[PDB]
């Protein structure tokens, strides 16, 4: 598991609020940090956590409402 993995998941305890998890190399560096209250803030937080914490590769995972704000299959992988 070489590239830094960034995931954005929605909390089911109240809908419409997200969280982000980062893993660089075999260890978790960010655990359940508040992303936001809309898909736009979650996409912005995912791109911010991928800008830093990143080697020359990364990967972003999210739902099909959050991954619409990220440019289509261009800034999602490296």
């Amino acid at each position: 598991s070489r590239p830094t993995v960034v995931t954005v998941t929605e909390t089911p305890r109240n809908p419409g609020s997200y969280e982000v998890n980062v893993e660089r190399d075999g260890k978790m560096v960010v655990g359940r940090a508040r992303a936001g209250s809309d898909p736009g803030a979650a996409a912005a937080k995912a791109m911010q956590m991928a800008m830093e914490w990143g080697s020359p590769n990364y990967v972003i995972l999210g739902s099909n409402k959050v991954l619409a704000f990220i440019p289509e299959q261009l800034r999602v992988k490296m």
Binding site: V29, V30, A33, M49, M51, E52, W53, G54
Partner: protein, 309 residues
Amino acid sequence: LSTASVLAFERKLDPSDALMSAGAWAQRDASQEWPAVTVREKSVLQTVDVANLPSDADTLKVRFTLRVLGGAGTPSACNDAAYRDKLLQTVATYVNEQGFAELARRYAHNLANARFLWRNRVGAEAVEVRINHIRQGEVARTWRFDALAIGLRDFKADAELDALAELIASGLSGSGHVLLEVVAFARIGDGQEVFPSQELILDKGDKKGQKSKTLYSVRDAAAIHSQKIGNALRTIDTWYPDEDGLGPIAVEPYGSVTSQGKAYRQPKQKLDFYTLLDNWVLRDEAPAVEQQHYVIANLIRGGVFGEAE
């Protein structure tokens, strides 16, 4: 019989975030609309956050509030009633021997000399502390202290210091409701550098170009963390195994100055919080009159004290 698997104590001496403002001296008796100082960025190929007084202001003012809640021995959670009843009997025995008067006097001493001004007290020229007792939204009693005459090392005596210690003792006992407002004026200099609380961020990345040092702020106003104020006015502990000359340190289990790197009250010696507490509640051994002050101060601070079993 056995220490409980869960044991938690609430926080007495609950402070708030200290807010900073700037102004001119001989105006402290009307200082209620002074402008709050703000942090700024500065390039050095790195970017830092600095703070500075305005060029027309030479006096810093720090303001916060304080509460004392009482009921120090009662835990918030437990697992067996036997240990809780023995603990209540032990702390009741302590307060029936001597009320909270030594601890309250040291707390009023730490409020008198403005030790919560951490690094902006060193280059000070004159410091004045004002303390108000808020009863029904108004002022019930005012105390005004000189902080440079009241030193840091030794614990001197004063009439108004005894009055403030009586107020804090009545608050800690459980016979009144004490709300304090603390304001401190320090005469640093015309446009000098003030030191807000530095920030810890557990999400900041590693690659270059990132900010090297950011400061704390509350709605575009430079402030100090509340836990730094608590650690500032918790430094009452001086009865430890090291010789006299270093000064008093803060009340922590295995009392340790981590910035230096040393750790006094190691568990190899029998002078930490946990073993003295276990001997007090289980083997009916009071360590000394001095160690009871340390154990009750560590219970006023609070924590999570649970043995597995």
